[PDB]
Write a protein that binds this ligand. Sequence first.
Ligand SMILES: Cc1ncc(COP(=O)(O)O)c(CN[C@@H](CC(C)C)C(=O)O)c1O
Ligand SMILES: Cc1ncc(COP(=O)(O)O)c(CN[C@@H](CC(C)C)C(=O)O)c1O
Lengths: 393, 395
Amino acid sequence: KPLSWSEAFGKGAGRIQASTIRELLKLPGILSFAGGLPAPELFPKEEAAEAAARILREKGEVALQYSPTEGYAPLRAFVAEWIGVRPEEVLITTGSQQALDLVGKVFLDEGSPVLLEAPSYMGAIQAFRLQGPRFLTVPAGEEGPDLDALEEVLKRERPRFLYLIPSFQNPTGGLTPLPARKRLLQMVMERGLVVVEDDAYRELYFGEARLPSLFELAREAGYPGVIYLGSFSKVLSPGLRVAFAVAHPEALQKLVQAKQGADLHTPMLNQMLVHELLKEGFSERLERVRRVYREKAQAMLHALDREVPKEVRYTRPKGGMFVWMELPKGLSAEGLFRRALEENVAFVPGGPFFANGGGENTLRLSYATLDREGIAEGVRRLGRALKGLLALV
Amino acid sequence: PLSWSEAFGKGAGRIQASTIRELLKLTQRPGILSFAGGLPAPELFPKEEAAEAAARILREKGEVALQYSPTEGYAPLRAFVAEWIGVRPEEVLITTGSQQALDLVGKVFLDEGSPVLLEAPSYMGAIQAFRLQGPRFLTVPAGEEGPDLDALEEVLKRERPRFLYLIPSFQNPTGGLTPLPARKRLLQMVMERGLVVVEDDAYRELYFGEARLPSLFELAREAGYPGVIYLGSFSKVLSPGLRVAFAVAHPEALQKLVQAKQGADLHTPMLNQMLVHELLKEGFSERLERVRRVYREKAQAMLHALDREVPKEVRYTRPKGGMFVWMELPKGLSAEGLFRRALEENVAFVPGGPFFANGGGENTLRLSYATLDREGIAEGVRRLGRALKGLLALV
Ligand SMILES: Cc1ncc(COP(=O)(O)O)c(CN[C@@H](CC(C)C)C(=O)O)c1O
Ligand SMILES: Cc1ncc(COP(=O)(O)O)c(CN[C@@H](CC(C)C)C(=O)O)c1O
């Protein structure tokens, strides 16, 4: 009886085939606009080094030992104070990608309806796809989800939850404005629906102020149905894998129960280190994050405006890390990617961001990682690839 | 008015057991001496060397350490694991604890109603991970010499489990040690039927005798059989709180684990992997020898104490490695009830029930001698003896 792997795997093995995540993470003179990797010039290496050594010397017996599933209590407290909730309503997760996996586990079943935008974040699609749901979509544009399309969906289908990224959506960069957020909240409250609000880019706004979150608006309305995800990845360090979920206790409790068997607890040194880094100077750190991303976005748009012919369209984000690019109808972003690689530049083709397919002429560009000169040079290389693609028609 | 209970899916009903989160916050009750969680001896933690190493990593390589990193793990760590275990680097996946490896295995191999084979009892974390997928648990008893192979033969004549989950070396929770001939017989049974084994080797290095037994993975590799997925961890030998472990498998299986890991957490934190690699680059053998000495001495301290304080109606194992003593009360007596009395005497342990996937074992309990110094072991056992005497006096 020779062993067959294909025959020994379960259904889960046939739902995890997309490889965008590992392909974006994989470790020469290629300039990357691919993964949403935060600017390394913002990492506080020296402060981190001091703080990590102090933790390990003075509290190493706690930091290196098994620790609570719910998270380091001072970090839960810091998060609660920042977000505006009780500490017991905060779960520390091993990145918000883990919170998405936990959400999928708690809420989805084979064939269960779930709603997100087309496009939306590939990580969330991948986490949810594991459970074998039926994906329902609405379009995403410059002002967020198409609420008219959503109204029609909700007449016929009750999603297990709605997954949204109101602030600088991955991958479009779209910003759901305040009146739309209120309308959306009304639509959800009228049917007692659950919303998973992913606020990874919360603090990366380019204007004067952050918009109220769906969670904030819900809290004001007395409505308990928003599960709120945030992360320290975009504002401090993605490699530490420290993030959080905030919810009504009944929901949060299920997330904590799921977390036990996922990894026991998020590494304790990491939580301690985030807390030590942010307990002073957080406001100021966030202001500097905004100034850097504003400047890189400006450089990206200047470079694109210079190098990209008008037959190719792209968004002009008001925050976050991404530009979203649309090629002429029927042109292949995958084909372009192969040409870009020969020109020593990378991006993410758009296909993985569309849960039910389509989008093969779209692509996402991240300006977060490179400095302004590498942005300018990377876009010059992209422009050459685009020009090659268009010239073949 | 929103209804949470109606909003959840089936998974919300399969995650109710709270043993894990309960064991992990016992620290919040510092006056209680713990024989509960398998928390490693903190006197072994290399705090100073770790502080120095972490600071050097963040100053010299902080742009790698603090950035998004490969799903498969830090390459020098993969290589280090590959050299230690005896495989190619590309056959290693770094995981956020072996608990995550368990969750990944469940994801890849189990569906609702699918059969899975494990012992009764077995590790509650594995039970918890697998239960999420809604499987049918098949069991065989576990004893001093590991799984009951005659019982296993009967199971395998009737069913093809998606995998067999075993812990051949110092099983959680019994401390059982599967001897070499039983390992070969198990291997033969699985090879003849083309089944998969998940071999959890958390306690690999914690042997009290002269040498480590061959793993089922090593035996399978010698026989040319690709069906063993091998799990190991740095938790019991270096630091559990860092959450760094590994899965080793044939590339076809390993690839599905890597695929699953993407959407679980993107990647295991990179500083943690670097730190583990830096700490183990030199002196690993000597570290391991020290681990063995310490747990050998704590096991001896525990048995000495039990032998003086525990009434002879109560049975307990005498482990040859690992972290645990497995205790069985007279039939019908409640480990849970004993636990409540133990809490009143300021000692904790883990009742046996969570370790039995299909129920049972309500008279059994696990004791961990890993965490306390010898004086705390002696005092905790005096406190446990008082609880036990109170339990037995009520009859
Ligand atoms: C919208 C959104 N939500 C969550 C995540 C996950 O981030 P953490 O787990 O670090 O908190 C993200 C991250 N996005 C990048 C992931 C790559 C694998 C690097 C990306 O390039 O999309 C997110 O955008
Ligand atoms: C047999 C066995 N396999 C895996 C694990 C998980 O450990 P890591 O994820 O740290 O690698 C364990 C650990 N066991 C303890 C867990 C408690 C929550 C602390 C235990 O008390 O059982 C294991 O024993």
